[PDB]
Paper text:
The Commander complex, a 16-protein assembly, plays multiple roles in cell homeostasis, cell cycle and immune response. The recently discovered multiprotein Commander complex is a master regulator of cellular homeostasis within endosomal transport and the trans-Golgi network. The complex regulates cell signaling by modulating trafficking of transmembrane channel proteins and receptors to the cell surface and diverting them from lysosomal degradation. We report the structure of the endogenous human Commander complex determined by cryogenic-electron microscopy (cryo-EM) and comprehensively map the molecular context and interactions of the Commander and individual complex interactions in human cells using affinity purification with mass spectrometry (AP–MS) and proximity labeling biotin identification (BioID).
The [name]-ring forms the highly interconnected core of the complex. NTDs of several COMMDs (2, 3, 4, 5, 7 and 10) bind a segment of the CCDCs via this interface, which we call the peptide-binding site. CCDC93 proceeds to circle around the NTD of COMMD2 in a headlock, binding the peptide-binding site via α9 and forming a long helix-loop-helix motif (HLH) (α10 and α11) that reaches all the way around to the NN–CH domain. The final helices (α12 and α13) predominantly bind the [name] domain of COMMD7, with α12 binding in a tight hydrophobic pocket, before reaching the I-coil region. CCDC22 occupies the lower half of the [name]-ring. Finally, α14 of CCDC22 binds [name] domains of COMMD1, COMMD6 and COMMD8 in a similar topology to α8, before reaching the peptide-binding sites on COMMD7 and COMMD10, and meeting CCDC93 at the I-coil region. Supporting our assignment, one XL–MS crosslink was identified between Lys318 of CCDC93 and Lys114 of COMMD7. The flexibility of the NTDs correlates with the occupancy of this binding site as empty sites on COMMD1 and COMMD9 are the most flexible, followed closely by COMMD7 and COMMD10, each binding a short helix between long flexible regions of CCDC22.
Numbering used by the authors:
A (entry chain I): 1 to 198
B (entry chain J): 69 to 202
C (entry chain G): 135 to 200
D (entry chain C): 1 to 195
E (entry chain H): 62 to 183
F (entry chain A): 65 to 190
G (entry chain E): 23 to 224
H (entry chain B), I (entry chain D): 1 to 199
Write the structure that this text describes.
């Protein structure tokens, strides 16, 4: 995360124009969460609430987005560290108010950011059925157990485009295949019962 | 074919464990392999195995790799809407290997000078994160 | 028909300097008639143990009937 | 221009003084044009109180006959001499021949604009833009020092799935070649005006 | 309505299926059958053609005269453009085909052979 | 024409009884060839004239459902059917369907209606 | 002349039409030309102006085409290269009425100009740009092939202004090559700027 | 300006003075043959046995020599700067003169190969055109609608692509006007100074 | 200056340049070279071995050969494009400075192949598509689940369409009701009547 | 896996083609309508010869016999 | 044509003859006489002498221009020949062109292989203190010094003093990942191990 | 020919009228210039099946047709371009129908039936290695 600038802090002075502390609080919370497209929507929301110019509102949302994520990225654990980020000429009551808001949310921010990391597609749900196969077109009678494994999987919607973000795949396992992968996955479990690897 | 698969499986286990030479000798005799074959394994593993273990370590488990980097530097002189320009432009080409398809995809990106410095500052953050691990 | 896996820790990210999140990646190779497909799935630490706990129930019911 | 036996019988009933008076003929004829050209699908277009005495099976049959002849006459660019010939064949009187021509002439331009709007076509180029760059270096080659042009065409058609811009690059020789082709094409339009 | 028309049911068997409805609803439905039977039957026949991988939904055509090209200045070649809308996999796909005088003659000559067989059945 | 022996030999005979015509022995060779090939040629012409999908194979199995993740005890059987389809000269698709004991019998009666349609049409000339 | 060596036919046609045109209508048209340059759809407003002025569509098209060309060619010139005195002189050689010249000059040089410059600079792009760049840094502890790996890598995700997006993994030997390449190009941009300022600017 | 030979690159080239210049001439031949056609490792074990050195010694020397020629051609380094670069290596005038000729003999051909590596933009190949008048349609039976049918052929990655397009007459007159102004720019005093000074 | 074979335009500068390269051959081998290029324009292939074998007379380098074949192809194609006669071509090539013997030779080969050239150039003229063939099957429907007895014919069409020469035809396959088929055939016959009025 | 929403059939004769004046062979054409995950419904059609139908119909009678005695 | 071919650092704007009348030819004659001394043309010429066209006197002027033009094409390349060849390649291909297209890919492979063998690799690592951030140029220079790609010498040496040597190409950890595993996950590992004991 | 001479003379004067008007930027084009310069949208030919009254209708079918339940025929399609295309193709089929052996037809249908009877009457890695070696 890049540092802030006097232009961004001047945009934060627009919060002195803002109508209430919770409006500031709202803009802080949403600007952390908001995407760029969300920032266009939030820009309309900001202009409607503040009635400041679109330039002031956009720079303000940019300044809060940059400021909040800078703290979250560094994980500044105290007011003293946060306050050092602000310039000495800033409006002290607003600067102190922002520090209070930032302290409350920062714990939530690291939790929310940690969930939304980039990854390979995530497992959403897992279901299974065991059947015994009893007959087929080619064997009159059988008694072979089988597992059907059903997994529901989600990909980042920005990578999906036309396709749906979530899909399901079935996978069939014989116990021979099942036993092979139970060994493979068991290795990792043994090496965490004591809290570090073998 | 079975013999080649059997030899592969023996060497695959040696990579996974990263077996020391003397331990490998005993395991070969434990499957009742003859002494000359067991010694032949130990010699061949000794030099070549360490390079092979490193080559396995660099393997990636992902559908796509970055494969190639390439760039061209240009000077803008004019376009239909402005005359008398003197702007450095960079084109970056990233070659991404999609091993699911065995096909390489070439991604082209324009940068202005300010945009390329912003990109540089992010790479400098990644390097500091990497440097924190050592 | 095949499975490959990678067990790791996320040390840092673009949103947080320090993270420390354990993950498991699986590659499943699935025969679909004449052709095969690769399915990539990432599991969190809680998901891995829930997954392993279920697949051990599967084993048990595959070993007894009626 | 050919017309089915169904259409001809509808006109033979419009030609009657008994079935339709001169008033009802005018009102049905106007309803015919309206139902062709109005964007509102006015289901009550035939509910004129002066039409109410006509058998609704006959009324709705002659209305579709009229509209069908209007579209066929329009498509085939029918002149008043053609219209008047066919109407007199259907035994129309001189007053109703005048009435039909008056309504047709009033609507002719709107009908022809409608008929001409139906179709599919190729993607239509609408604009062009260009960039001039001087090529300096590659990570494999220094002192390139050659100009290149970066050209974009803007296309504006939706008759088939398409992307709105076509981008390509030209050297000096390639752009000089391209311009010569387009001027060769333009010189052929000029020749065609001498026909 | 699809079921009773497709099966060519007798009126008495339709009445017996309507025994539970209000008398005006019974009478309404019988009247709808008598007035619309032939129109519904044609809709079914159209749906039987859709038991196929692709169907021609609509077509259009244009006649044009080519006056010149980069190859030859006194070209004066008539061409037909035929546009097809083909419904497949629940989607409509646009196709276009361009024909000279001789290609159009071969096309029409082939469809006239098909039409001769159609008219032995139709 | 898909000629029968009377048509085949009459046509070939007319070809023999003309200037530069084939010999009767050549026609006999052609007839012997055509006897075996007639079966193969006819079926090839069917494939050439078909550009909808065709049935390439049917396969099925029946399973006893016993337990699932949540349903600790199941017993109702199920039929699983794989249907292989393709167009001439193209790669096969596989369609896989699952049926309970009720839907198996609903489909079975639907096929019995096809057979009874055929039987009527060929009995109507009686 | 800023119009090039030979006068474009649409500009010559427009310049003779201006003698008949009320200045009120000229200033109404000029707003539509300027706003179209800023990318605003004006087709319906132009049509209303047409019937209001009783201009046939053949004359609207000639006027609008000629005004667009004149402004396009002037606004593409830097303030070092077209200036109010020479612009006004050159337009009088077209016999444009002097009051209309003053209106045209106010568009090219007045407070409208900075927004027009911003729109004109957007058109130099031809390839897509980086819209977002995210990463995570991971260490592999174990793998199917190795009981202990301990090998870092960077997973990267790019979003481009094209609306395309890519997620791919970078070996650390490949990250070093990428980082080197980007710093090298930045040195060579700065060297090229110094060549230009000391030889092309004088 | 000068070549900055890395210490490993120097250590590979140090094999060159260890053998007769007639063998270095053979290394020069096979080096440029690999650039021209592709490398074939089967020769390295042959020269190894002939010279009583390891195959890696032959490989390192020859692949180091190819890189010397490639980097010189990339830079288009002058004969004077080339010598000032090479004299960091200690070997004698006969080998220094051999290498200089081997560079100047081949730099223009190598630079042609090196030009193929650049980022692969789509580019113009050819254009076809046809003047069509539409005279009738299914819906309307007499018309004159002139259009220019255009077929644009493009290259990318060595693969040809084609696009079929349309213009009206007045748009075609606009297209020529704009791309004539494009060609006129290279004649302006601004672009003349760039070509004159950025060299 | 304007020339008929240039299309009532002044001569291109690259053409006027390379006309001076034609004068460098003997008149006897300039005529032989015309035959090789003209064969290629007629689709009969090209013999690069013969082209190179005879142009060794003038000691052409491969850049001369490329420019020579290019200018002969331009002259012959563009005269045939505009239906210029060999009498005009000879006179107006001489205006550009081609020697009178070279002018002669070049035009007595054009005079022999002028007519087959124009027939080939019409075949090569821009096409969007070509109809390569038609296939059809007629079916009769007996009964259905959806309608107890149907008893209607149905048609299947397959149209082979070629986008470019030397490529396999794309099949367009579709099914039609007998009503849709009847209206399609009737519409194509109306189009054909209009076509026949034009040519 | 997939589930049948509907089943339809038609019986017809192939009468004539451009290559073969007398085809005159019967077929059964089946349309299957199937629901995917999340209920997306699609259709698939295929032809059978009359011998193929008899086999197809015969095997479903085997399925119905085993499914009772499973 | 010779003047514009030379590009001799003058704002040469002038028009070709176009078979123009008197008037245009006179204005051009003044411009030519104006350009010649700025090109340092050794031979003088006069506008009236252009109209009378004294070949005897104009000949040395042409000798200057022709000699300078030839020299400039010999370094810059002949454009019209490159156009002629481009018209060939659009539809024709010599046997040597087909050969080059055949072997192109295997040749290209050899140079990307050499580029990997001799790639720059990170020799030094800079200290995190004494922030170099004060300008873009010294940050970018410091980065390139990490790959050895070096008051110019004094700038390097003061920058190089902020660095430490290196010896490894891949950042493989000495099992220090336990520190970040345990220090942040272990409480979650203890919860999960406890719950998946209790559930069974 | 006089007829083709009249056509070519009409063609040439149309091209003049189009060349005489400049290109106008798409955001400024009024509807006339949208048609000439190709930024108007054409609509595809799409036909819907109509219901028409029948004069010979009697009984219950007539009682339907005589009522507001049968809409006026062109108004049965919402859009004028589809409304035009529907009437055009409806009238085209009527011409095909009205412009178009019983022993021959019965014979063919009996020939088809015999073929149906004759057709029916035939009824009358380390992972896979670990599995193979240690879990198979």
């Amino acid at each position: 995360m890049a540092a802030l600038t006097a232009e961004h802090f001047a945009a934060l002075q627009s919060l002195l124009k803002a109508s209430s502390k919770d409006v500031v609080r709202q803009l802080c919370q949403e600007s952390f969460s908001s995407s760029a497209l969300g920032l266009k929507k939030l820009l309309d929301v900001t202009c409607s609430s503040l009635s400041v110019t679109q330039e002031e509102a956009e720079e303000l949302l940019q300044a809060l987005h940059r400021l909040t994520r800078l703290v979250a990225f560094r994980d500044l654990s105290s007011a003293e560290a946060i306050l050092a980020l602000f310039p000495e000429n800033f409006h002290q009551n607003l600067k102190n108010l922002l520090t209070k808001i930032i302290l409350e949310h920062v714990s939530t921010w690291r939790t929310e950011a940690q969930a939304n990391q980039i990854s390979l597609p995530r497992l959403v749900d897992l279901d299974w059925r065991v059947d015994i196969k009893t007959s087929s077109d080619s064997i009159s009678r059988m008694a072979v157990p089988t597992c059907l494994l059903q997994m529901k999987i989600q990909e980042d919607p920005s990578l999906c485009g036309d396709k749906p973000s979530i899909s399901a795949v079935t996978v069939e396992l014989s116990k021979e295949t099942l036993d092979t992968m139970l060994d493979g996955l068991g290795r990792i479990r043994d090496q965490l019962s004591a809290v570090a690897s073998k | 074919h079975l013999v080649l698969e059997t030899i592969s499986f023996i060497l695959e286990q040696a990579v996974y464990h990263n077996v020391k030479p003397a331990a490998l000798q005993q395991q070969l005799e434990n499957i009742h392999l003859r002494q000359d074959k067991a010694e032949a394994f130990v010699n061949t593993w000794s030099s070549m195995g360490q390079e092979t273990v490193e080559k396995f370590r660099q393997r990636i488990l992902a559908p796509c790799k970055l494969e190639t980097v390439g760039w061209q530097l240009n000077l803008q002189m004019a376009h239909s809407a402005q005359a008398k320009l003197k702007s450095p432009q960079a084109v970056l080409q990233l070659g991404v290997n999609n091993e699911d398809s065995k096909s390489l995809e070439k991604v082209l990106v324009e940068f202005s000078h300010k945009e390329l410095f912003d990109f540089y500052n992010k790479l400098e953050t990644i390097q500091a994160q990497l440097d924190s691990l050592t | 028909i095949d499975m490959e896996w990678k067990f790791g820790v996320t040390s840092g990210s673009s949103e947080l300097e320090k993270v420390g999140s354990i993950f498991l990646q699986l590659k499943l190779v699935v025969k679909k008639g004449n052709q095969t497909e690769n399915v990539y799935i990432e599991l969190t630490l809680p998901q891995f143990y829930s997954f392993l706990h279920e697949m051990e129930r599967v084993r048990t019911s595959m070993e007894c009937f009626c | 221009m050919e017309l089915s036996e169904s259409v001809q019988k509808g006109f033979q009933m419009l030609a009657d003084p008994r079935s339709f008076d001169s008033n009802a003929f005018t009102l049905l004829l106007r309803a015919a044009f309206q139902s062709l050209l109005d964007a509102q699908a006015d289901e009550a277009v035939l509910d004129h109180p002066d039409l109410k005495h006509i058998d609704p099976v006959v009324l709705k049959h002659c209305h579709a006959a009229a509209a069908t002849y209007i579209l066929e006459a329009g498509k085939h660019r029918a002149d008043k001499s053609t219209l008047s010939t066919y109407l007199e064949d259907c035994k129309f009187d001189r007053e109703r021949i005048e009435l039909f021509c008056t309504e047709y002439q009033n609507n002719k331009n709107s009908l022809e604009i409608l008929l001409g709007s139906i179709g599919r076509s190729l993607p239509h180029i609408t604009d062009v833009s260009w960039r001039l760059e001087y090529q300096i270096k590659t990570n494999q080659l220094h002192r390139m020092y050659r100009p290149a042009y970066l050209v974009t065409l803007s296309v504006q058609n939706t008759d088939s799935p398409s992307y709105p811009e076509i981008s390509f690059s030209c050297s000096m020789e390639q752009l000089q070649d391209l311009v010569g082709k387009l001027k060769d094409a333009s010189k052929s339009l000029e020749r065609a005006t001498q026909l | 309505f699809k079921a009773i028309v497709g099966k060519n049911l007798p009126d008495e068997e339709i009445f017996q299926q309507l025994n539970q409805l209000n008398s005006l609803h019974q009478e309404t439905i019988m009247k709808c059958v008598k007035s619309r039977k032939d129109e519904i039957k044609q809709a079914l026949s159209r749906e039987i053609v859709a038991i196929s991988s692709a169907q021609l939904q609509d077509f259009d055509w244009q006649v044009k005269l080519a006056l010149s090209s980069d190859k030859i200045a006194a070209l004066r070649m008539p061409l037909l453009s035929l546009h097809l809308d083909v419904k497949e996999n629940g989607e409509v796909k646009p196709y276009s085909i361009e024909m000279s005088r001789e290609e159009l003659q071969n096309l029409i000559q082939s469809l006239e052979a098909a039409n001769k067989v159609v008219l032995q059945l139709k | 024409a898909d000629m029968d022996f009377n048509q085949l030999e009459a046509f070939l005979t007319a070809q023999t009884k003309k200037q530069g015509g084939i010999t009767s022995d050549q026609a006999a060779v052609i007839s012997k060839f055509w006897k075996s090939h007639k079966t193969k040629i006819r079926e090839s012409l069917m494939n050439q004239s078909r550009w909808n999908s065709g049935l390439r194979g049917l396969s099925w199995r029946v399973d006893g459902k016993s337990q699932s993740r949540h349903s600790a005890q199941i017993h109702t059987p199920v039929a699983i059917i794989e249907l292989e389809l393709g167009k001439y000269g193209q790669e096969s698709e596989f369609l896989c369907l699952e049926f309970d004991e009720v839907k198996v019998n609903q489909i079975l009666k639907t096929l019995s209606e096809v057979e009874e349609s055929i039987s009527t049409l060929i009995s109507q000339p009686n | 002349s800023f119009l090039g060596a030979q006068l474009p036919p649409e500009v010559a046609a427009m310049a003779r039409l201006l003698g008949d045109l009320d200045r009120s209508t000229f200033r109404k048209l000029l707003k539509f030309v300027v706003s179209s340059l800023q990318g605003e759809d004006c087709r319906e407003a132009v049509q209303r102006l047409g019937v209001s002025a009783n201009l046939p569509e053949e004359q609207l098209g000639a006027l609008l085409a000629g005004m667009h060309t004149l402004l396009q060619q002037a606004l593409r010139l830097p303030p070092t290269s077209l200036k109010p005195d020479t612009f006004r002189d050159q337009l009088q050689e077209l016999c444009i009425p002097q009051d209309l010249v003053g209106d045209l000059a106010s568009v090219v040089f007045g407070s409208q100009r900075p927004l027009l410059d911003s729109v004109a600079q957007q058109q130099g792009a031809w390839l897509p740009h980086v819209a977002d760049f995210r990463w995570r840094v991971d260490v592999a502890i174990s793998t199917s092939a190795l009981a202990r790996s301990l090998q870092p890598s960077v997973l990267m995700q790019l979003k481009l202004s094209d609306g395309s997006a890519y997620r791919f993994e970078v070996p650390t030997a490949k990250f070093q090559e990428l980082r080197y390449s980007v710093a090298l190009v930045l040195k060579e941009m700065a060297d090229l700027e110094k060549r230009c300022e000391r030889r092309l600017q004088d | 300006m000068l070549l900055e030979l890395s210490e490993e690159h120097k250590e590979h080239l140090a094999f060159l003075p260890q053998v007769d210049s007639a063998v270095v001439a053979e290394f020069g031949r096979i080096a440029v043959e690999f650039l021209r056609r592709g490398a074939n490792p089967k020769i390295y074990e042959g020269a190894a046995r002939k010279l009583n050195v390891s195959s890696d010694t032959v490989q390192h020397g020859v692949e180091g020599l190819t890189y010397l020629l490639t980097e010189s051609s990339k830079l288009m380094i002058s004969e004077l700067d080339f010598q000032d670069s090479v004299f960091v290596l200690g070997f004698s005038e006969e080998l220094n003169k051999l290498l200089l000729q081997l560079y100047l003999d081949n730099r223009k051909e190598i630079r042609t190969i090196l030009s193929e590596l650049a980022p692969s933009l789509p580019s113009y190949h050819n254009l076809e055109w046809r003047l069509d008048v539409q005279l009738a349609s299914r819906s309307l039976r007499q018309q004159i609608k002139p259009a220019v049918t255009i077929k644009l052929h493009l290259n990318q990655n060595g693969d040809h692509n084609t696009k079929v397009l349309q213009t009206d007459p007045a748009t075609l007159l606009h297209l020529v006007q704009q791309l004539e102004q494009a060609l006129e720019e290279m004649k302006t005093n601004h672009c003349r100074r760039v070509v004159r000074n950025i060299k | 200056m304007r020339f008929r074979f240039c299309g009532d335009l002044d001569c291109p500068d690259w053409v006027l340049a390379e006309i001076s390269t034609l004068a460098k051959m003997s008149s006897v081998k300039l005529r032989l070279l015309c035959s090789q290029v003209l064969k290629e324009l007629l689709g009969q292939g090209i013999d690069y071995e013969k082209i190179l074998k005879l142009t060794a007379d003038a000691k052409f380098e491969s850049g001369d050969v490329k420019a020579t074949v290019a200018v002969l192809s331009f002259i012959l194609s563009s005269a045939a494009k505009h239906s210029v006669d060999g009498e005009s071509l000879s006179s107006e090539l001489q205006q550009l400075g081609l020697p009178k013997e070279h002018a002669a030779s070049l035009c007595r080969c054009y005079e022999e192949k002028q007519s087959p050239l124009q027939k080939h150039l019409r075949v090569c003229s821009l096409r969007m598509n070509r109809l390569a063939g038609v296939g059809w099957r007629v079916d009769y429907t007996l009964s259905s689940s959806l309608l107890q007895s149907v008893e209607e014919p149905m048609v299947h069409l397959r149209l082979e369409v070629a986008a470019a020469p030397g490529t396999p035809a794309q099949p367009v396959a579709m099914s039609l009701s007998a009503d849709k088929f009847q209206v399609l055939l009737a519409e194509l016959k109306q189009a054909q009547t209009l076509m026949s009025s034009l040519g | 896996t997939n589930q049948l929403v509907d089943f339809q059939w038609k019986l017809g004769m192939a009468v004539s083609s451009d290559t073969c004046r007398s085809l005159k062979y019967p077929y059964v054409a089946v349309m299957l309508k199937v629901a995917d995950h999340s209920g997306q419904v699609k259709t698939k059609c295929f032809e059978m010869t009359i011998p193929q139908f008899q086999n197809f119909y015969r095997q479903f009678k085997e399925i119905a016999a085993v499914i009772e005695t499973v | 044509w010779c003047i514009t071919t030379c590009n001799f650092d003058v704002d040469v704007d002038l028009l070709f003859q176009e078979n123009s009348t008197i008037g245009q030819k006179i204005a051009l004659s003044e411009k030519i006489v104006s350009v010649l001394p700025r090109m340092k043309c050794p031979h003088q010429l006069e506008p009236h002498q252009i109209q009378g066209m004294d070949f005897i006197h104009i000949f040395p002027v042409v000798q200057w221009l022709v000699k300078r033009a030839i020299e400039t094409k010999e370094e810059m390349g002949d454009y019209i020949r490159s156009y002629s060849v481009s018209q060939f390649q659009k539809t024709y291909s010599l046997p040597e062109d087909d050969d080059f297209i055949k072997r192109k890919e295997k040749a290209i492979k050899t140079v990307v292989d050499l580029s990997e063998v001799y790639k720059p690799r990170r020799k030094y690592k800079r200290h995190q203190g004494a922030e170099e951030l004060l300008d873009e140029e010294s940050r970018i220079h410091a980065t390139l010094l990490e790959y050895g790609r070096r008051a110019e010498e004094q700038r390097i040496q003061s920058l190089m003093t902020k660095m430490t040597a290196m010896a490894n190409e891949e950042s493989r950890l000495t099992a220090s990942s336990v520190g970040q595993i345990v220090g942040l996950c272990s409480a979650e590992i203890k919860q999960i191990v406890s719950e998946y004991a209790e559930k069974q | 020919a006089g007829d083709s001479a009249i056509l070519l003379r009409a063609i040439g004067s149309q091209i003049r009228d189009q060349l005489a008007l400049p290109w106008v930027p798409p955001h400024l084009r009024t509807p006339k210039l949208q048609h000439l310069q190709g930024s108007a949208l054409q609509k595809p030919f799409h036909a819907s099946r109509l219901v028409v009254p029948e004069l010979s209708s009697r009984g219950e079918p007539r009682e339907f047709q005589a009522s507001p339940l049968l809409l006026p025929v062109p108004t049965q399609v919402p859009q004028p371009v589809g409304r035009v295309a529907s009437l055009l193709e409806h009238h085209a089929l009527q011409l095909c129908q009205q412009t178009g052996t019983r022993a021959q037809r019965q014979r063919l249908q009996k020939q088809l039936t015999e073929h149906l009877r004759q057709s029916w009457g035939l009824l009358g890695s380390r992972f896979t290695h670990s599995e193979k070696f240690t879990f198979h």
